[PDB]
């Protein structure tokens, strides 16, 4: 919580539009499946999609998936608060905090997700699974678990800006 409304300009990058076929009586009923993640360009970057009959249909159900969910990703100016090895679903992600002009060095689903979700310098090299859905899953859990310093002082009551460096 809270579920952020679709109230901004979405990026709508496509992660990958995979084939799929249910092996039924008569061959294989082929249906496209695409998990393409929409991005707000400020921090609302959510990545889920569905299936449909045509390639544009998978674009439509994917965009409906982007209007489903969104994440926060609090990070003070080309970084995250604590560079935590965040992966959930058998596919890791090792995203550290990088400097200002160190670029968004990430992979396929990491470079799509962080590349369309407001990243400036966050070094990322995975360790684990390589499915698309597993990449957006563990990357979404890792981006949805990294803590912000002001709120981290505001919820653990020691002092705000008492942990600096």
């Amino acid at each position: 919580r809270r579920i952020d409304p679709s109230k901004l300009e979405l990026e709508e990058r496509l992660v990958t539009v995979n084939r799929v076929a249910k092996v039924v009586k008569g061959g294989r009923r082929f249906r496209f499946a695409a998990l393409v993640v929409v991005g707000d360009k400020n921090g609302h970057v959510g990545f889920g999609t569905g299936k449909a009959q045509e390639v544009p249909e998978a674009i439509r159900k994917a965009v409906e998936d982007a209007k489903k969910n969104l994440i926060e990703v609090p990070m003070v100016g080309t970084t995250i608060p604590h560079e935590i090895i965040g992966r959930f679903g058998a596919g890791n992600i090792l995203l550290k905090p990088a400097s200002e002009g160190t670029g968004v060095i990430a992979g396929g689903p990491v470079r799509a997700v962080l590349e369309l979700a407001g990243v400036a310098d966050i070094l990322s090299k995975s360790l684990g699974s390589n499915t698309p859905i597993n990449m957006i899953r563990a990357t979404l859990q890792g981006l949805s678990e990294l803590k912000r310093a002001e709120d981290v002082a505001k919820l653990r009551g020691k002092s705000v800006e008492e942990l600096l460096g």
């Binding site: 919820l155 653990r156 600096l164």
Partner: protein
């Protein structure tokens, strides 16, 4: 049993740290004592009140984590393994977390914190690490 005491306390604050319990027990020792004053003074738990008695023990701390899931004890890790010991020099005393957490290196003048131990500028046995 009794492989390591500090790992028993850290497993206590961890398992109770996810259980959502109000108070937490412990085995009362000088590491639970000085680590209770350090980890209580840094503002994770509400209060440690070491209710001592015969024969040994026994500390009793309360989880100072409010409504928001995961309070000031948000995750702990054995940075020093009793069995294969960590080490950290002056310049190599690593501050765990980066900006959120804090590590507790057992310095040569008392069980310090991360930033205070870097303030003394002398490291020692990496006592525990609270990410």
């Amino acid at each position: 049993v009794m492989t390591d005491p500090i790992a028993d306390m850290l497993t206590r604050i961890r398992n109770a740290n996810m259980v959502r319990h109000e108070k937490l027990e412990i085995p009362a020792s000088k590491l639970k004592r000085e680590i209770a004053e350090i980890l209580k003074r840094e503002g994770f738990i509400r209060d440690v009140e070491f209710v001592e008695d015969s024969k040994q023990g026994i500390i009793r701390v309360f989880l100072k984590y409010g409504q928001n899931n995961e309070r000031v004890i948000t995750g702990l890790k054995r940075i020093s393994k009793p069995g294969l010991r960590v080490y950290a020099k002056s310049n190599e005393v690593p501050r765990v977390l980066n900006g959120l957490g804090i590590a507790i290196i057992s310095t040569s003048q008392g069980v310090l914190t991360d930033k205070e131990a870097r303030a003394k500028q002398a490291g020692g046995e990496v006592l525990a690490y609270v990410w």
